[PDB]
Design a protein around this ligand. Structure first.
Ligand SMILES: CC(C)(C)c1cccc(CN[C@H]2CS(=O)(=O)C[C@@H](Cc3ccc4[nH]cc(CC(F)F)c4c3)[C@@H]2O)c1
Length: 376
């Protein structure tokens, strides 16, 4: 039964997608950010100006202190805390309880968001990137070990937000058309390989290893599509050329300035689609996912800006590889098939579209080139 797991995610634009979890005995309810880009389960466990509730260890009779400190520095934001174990459940997920590692966050810097409505983070990637080191078993590994739940999960993130995390199986009600799979190159992040990028159907014509310098990952905790410097600059130039009819603030393309139009007058049609071709499961085959401006120009929720419709450019520069974040994942049904070491993409029920264009997953595409596109 996955019907009860449907629509178990909530969120605000730019502030991630969260699921309700409980920790401790008796259970304490907390909202937890779903993040495929990390591997630590961590919850606020001390007062913070931006937390309206937190994990109170002294009130759980099943809490065990591991007497070990832990620190996680993200690209933006960091926290410090104390490791322990306790019982964890997902009320609107699988009907199981597991004992898992939990980092009790005691200090933090730019981690919690004012008004985000979540109080913790669930890192769904592999032990390789867990802190303090890879010996700290991640939540999903514990869940599979301790229960009969199949080793996979899927995410349907929906734009303005909500969505579904389905654990243990595939919900065919959440997508249409074909599911296309790209291999997980290595299990640490969910690392994948991009073999080609097009803007409105025009090839960026780079050596395809540049697209994966120095890795490409699928990362639900990150809002933006992040691209390696060289690829970012070229994509921005290509996108600028398409939307040349309208001029925008210099800081817009830097993600430092919003662009606003009168309510309901956003000129979506002047902006190009972006296609990412992902390595297929068969030699020299790929498939493409196509992203509309409704995805990469993300609406800002702030009430202060609500007189018009304002958007932030949700593509940004990366020094640590490509990050296919939420704006890439939104509208797609994304299957993290850990058992078969692959990630699947299909058009979801909440996929982005207007009358002329639609987000799509299409294939196969074939290349004569014999160069692998993985970096290093
Ligand atoms: C493995 C680890 C050491 C955690 C690490 C270090 C650098 C980069 C990564 C890749 N994954 C990262 C990329 S990121 O830092 O942009 C967002 C991060 C999750 C994260 C962390 C704090 C956060 N605070 C607010 C948000 C909401 C977000 F949507 F803006 C948020 C999301 C991912 O988890 C992992």
């Amino acid at each position: 039964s996955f019907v009860e797991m449907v629509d178990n995610l909530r969120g605000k634009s730019g502030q991630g997608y969260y699921v309700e979890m409980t920790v401790g005995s008796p259970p304490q309810t907390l909202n937890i950010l779903v993040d495929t880009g990390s591997s630590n389960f961590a919850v606020g466990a001390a007062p913070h100006p931006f937390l309206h509730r937190y994990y109170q260890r002294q009130l759980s009779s099943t809490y065990r202190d591991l007497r070990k400190g832990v620190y996680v520095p993200y690209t933006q934001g960091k926290w410090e805390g104390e490791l322990g174990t306790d019982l964890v459940s997902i009320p609107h997920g699988p009907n199981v309880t597991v004992r898992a590692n939990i980092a009790a966050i005691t200090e933090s810097d730019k981690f919690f968001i004012n008004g985000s409505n979540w109080e913790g983070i669930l890192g769904l990637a592999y032990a390789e990137i867990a802190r303090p080191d890879d010996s700290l078993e991640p939540f999903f590994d514990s869940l599979v070990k301790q229960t009969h739940v199949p080793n996979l999960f899927s995410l349907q993130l929906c734009g303005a937000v909500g969505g579904s995390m389905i654990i243990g199986g595939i919900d065919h009600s959440l997508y249409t058309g074909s599911l296309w799979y790209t291999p997980i190159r290595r299990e640490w992040y969910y690392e994948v390989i991009i073999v080609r990028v097009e803007i409105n159907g025009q090839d960026l014509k780079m050596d395809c290893k540049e697209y994966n310098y120095d890795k490409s990952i699928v990362d639900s905790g990150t809002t933006n599509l992040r691209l390696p410097k060289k690829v970012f600059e070229a994509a921005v130039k290509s996108i600028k050329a398409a939307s040349s009819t309208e001029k925008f603030p210099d800081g817009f393309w830097l993600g430092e300035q919003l662009v606003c139009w009168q309510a309901g007058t956003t000129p979506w049609n002047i902006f190009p689609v972006i296609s990412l071709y992902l390595m297929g499961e068969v030699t020299n085959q790929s498939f493409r996912i196509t992203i509309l401006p409704q995805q990469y120009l993300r609406p800002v929720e702030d009430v202060a800006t609500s007189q018009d419709d304002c958007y932030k450019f949700a593509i940004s520069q990366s020094s640590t590889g490509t990050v296919m974040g939420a704006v890439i994942m939104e509208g797609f049904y994304v299957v993290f098939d850990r058992a078969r070491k692959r990630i699947g993409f299909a058009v979801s029920a909440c996929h982005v579209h207007d009358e002329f264009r639609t987000a799509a997953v299409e294939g196969p595409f074939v290349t004569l080139d014999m160069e692998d596109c993985g970096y290093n």
